Design an enzyme around this catalytic site. Structure first.
Site, PDB file in Angstrom:
ATOM      1  N   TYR A  38     -88.491 113.930  -6.046  1.00  0.00           N
ATOM      2  CA  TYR A  38     -89.442 113.883  -5.083  1.00  0.00           C
ATOM      3  C   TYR A  38     -89.959 114.895  -4.446  1.00  0.00           C
ATOM      4  CZ  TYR A  38     -88.296 108.855  -5.363  1.00  0.00           C
ATOM      5  OH  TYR A  38     -87.943 107.729  -5.741  1.00  0.00           O
ATOM      6  N   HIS A  40     -93.260 113.071  -6.752  1.00  0.00           N
ATOM      7  CA  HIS A  40     -93.663 112.913  -7.870  1.00  0.00           C
ATOM      8  C   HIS A  40     -94.742 111.976  -8.212  1.00  0.00           C
ATOM      9  CE1 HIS A  40     -91.895 108.847  -8.803  1.00  0.00           C
ATOM     10  NE2 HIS A  40     -90.763 109.367  -8.387  1.00  0.00           N
ATOM     11  N   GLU A  58     -95.748 109.923  -4.528  1.00  0.00           N
ATOM     12  CA  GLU A  58     -95.097 109.270  -3.617  1.00  0.00           C
ATOM     13  C   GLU A  58     -93.990 110.194  -3.124  1.00  0.00           C
ATOM     14  OE1 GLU A  58     -91.744 106.580  -4.984  1.00  0.00           O
ATOM     15  OE2 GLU A  58     -92.920 106.575  -6.761  1.00  0.00           O
ATOM     16  N   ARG A  77     -92.185 104.497   1.256  1.00  0.00           N
ATOM     17  CA  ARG A  77     -92.552 105.830   0.712  1.00  0.00           C
ATOM     18  C   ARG A  77     -93.956 105.837   1.270  1.00  0.00           C
ATOM     19  NH1 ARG A  77     -88.586 105.498  -1.147  1.00  0.00           N
ATOM     20  NH2 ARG A  77     -87.670 105.093  -3.154  1.00  0.00           N
ATOM     21  N   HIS A  92     -90.341  98.907  -1.044  1.00  0.00           N
ATOM     22  CA  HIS A  92     -89.581  98.206  -2.259  1.00  0.00           C
ATOM     23  C   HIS A  92     -89.014  96.980  -1.466  1.00  0.00           C
ATOM     24  CE1 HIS A  92     -89.659 100.741  -5.837  1.00  0.00           C
ATOM     25  NE2 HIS A  92     -88.877 101.687  -5.062  1.00  0.00           N
ATOM     26  N   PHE A 100     -93.535  97.837  -5.842  1.00  0.00           N
ATOM     27  CA  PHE A 100     -93.990  97.930  -4.397  1.00  0.00           C
ATOM     28  C   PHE A 100     -94.779  96.893  -3.840  1.00  0.00           C
ATOM     29  CE2 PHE A 100     -92.915 102.599  -6.032  1.00  0.00           C
ATOM     30  CZ  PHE A 100     -92.150 102.799  -4.798  1.00  0.00           C
TER      31      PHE A 100
HETATM   32  N1  LIG Z   1     -93.307 100.604  -9.182  1.00  0.00           N
HETATM   33  C1  LIG Z   1     -93.815 101.868  -9.481  1.00  0.00           C
HETATM   34  N2  LIG Z   1     -93.025 102.725  -9.902  1.00  0.00           N
HETATM   35  C2  LIG Z   1     -93.662 103.999 -10.188  1.00  0.00           C
HETATM   36  C3  LIG Z   1     -95.152 103.956 -10.059  1.00  0.00           C
HETATM   37  N3  LIG Z   1     -95.338 105.449 -10.568  1.00  0.00           N
HETATM   38  C4  LIG Z   1     -94.302 105.985 -10.861  1.00  0.00           C
HETATM   39  N4  LIG Z   1     -93.143 105.020 -10.878  1.00  0.00           N
HETATM   40  C5  LIG Z   1     -91.983 105.473 -11.168  1.00  0.00           C
HETATM   41  O1  LIG Z   1     -91.904 104.421 -12.547  1.00  0.00           O
HETATM   42  C6  LIG Z   1     -90.433 103.964 -12.654  1.00  0.00           C
HETATM   43  C7  LIG Z   1     -90.123 102.385 -12.525  1.00  0.00           C
HETATM   44  O2  LIG Z   1     -90.689 101.816 -11.249  1.00  0.00           O
HETATM   45  C8  LIG Z   1     -89.663 104.556 -11.469  1.00  0.00           C
HETATM   46  O3  LIG Z   1     -89.052 105.664 -12.202  1.00  0.00           O
HETATM   47  C9  LIG Z   1     -90.749 104.816 -10.428  1.00  0.00           C
HETATM   48  O4  LIG Z   1     -90.396 105.792  -9.480  1.00  0.00           O
HETATM   49  P1  LIG Z   1     -89.437 105.822  -8.225  1.00  0.00           P
HETATM   50  O5  LIG Z   1     -88.551 104.795  -8.718  1.00  0.00           O
HETATM   51  O6  LIG Z   1     -89.182 107.126  -7.872  1.00  0.00           O
HETATM   52  O7  LIG Z   1     -90.610 105.347  -7.197  1.00  0.00           O
HETATM   53  C10 LIG Z   1     -96.014 102.976  -9.454  1.00  0.00           C
HETATM   54  O8  LIG Z   1     -97.032 103.078  -9.530  1.00  0.00           O
HETATM   55  N5  LIG Z   1     -95.241 101.953  -9.301  1.00  0.00           N
END
Ligand SMILES: Nc1nc2c(ncn2[C@@H]2O[C@H](CO)[C@@H](O)[C@H]2OP(=O)(O)O)c(=O)[nH]1
Ligand SMILES: [Ca+2]
Ligand SMILES: [Ca+2]
Length: 104
Positions: A38, A40, A58, A77, A92, A100
């Site tokens: 993070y 990212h 995020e 986030r 989450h 999300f």
């Molecule tokens: N749910 C969700 N995950 C995202 C999004 N963009 C990036 N991710 C990343 O895609 C993968 C599946 O959810 C995870 O690695 C998540 O990162 P984080 O888990 O760090 O949030 C988004 O728009 N929605």
């Protein structure tokens, strides 16, 4: 009263700004922390109706009031863009798998 409610977590605008400032600084310096790297890019798979422009990033906002430094990111986030504008606060909590939902 809470400006943002993520599940049971209560956040004020100051909490969001403090979290956003830390994540934005790391973004501008080209650095990341934590095993999940993070901050990212946030791709917006959920299709939230953000009013500000992309790209989105995020960064974890913690219920304790402390600024994220690399441990467990928790469920909440702050999403900010390239112009240092807050897109939204998401979580989450109350969502399926790794999806999300928006904080109210
Ligand atoms: N749910 C969700 N995950 C995202 C999004 N963009 C990036 N991710 C990343 O895609 C993968 C599946 O959810 C995870 O690695 C998540 O990162 P984080 O888990 O760090 O949030 C988004 O728009 N929605
Ligand atoms: Ca607080
Ligand atoms: Ca503290």
């Amino acid at each position: 009263a809470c400006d943002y409610t993520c599940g049971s977590n209560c956040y004020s605008s100051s909490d969001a700004s403090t979290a956003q400032a830390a994540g934005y600084k790391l973004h501008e310096d080209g650095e990341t922390v934590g095993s999940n790297s993070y901050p990212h890019k946030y791709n917006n798979y959920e299709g939230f109706d953000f009013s500000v422009s992309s790209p989105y990033y995020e960064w974890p906002i913690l219920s304790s009031g402390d600024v994220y430094s690399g441990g467990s990111p928790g469920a909440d986030r702050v999403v900010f863009n390239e112009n240092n504008q807050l897109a939204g606060v998401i979580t989450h909590t109350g969502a399926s798998g790794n999806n999300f939902v928006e904080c109210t």
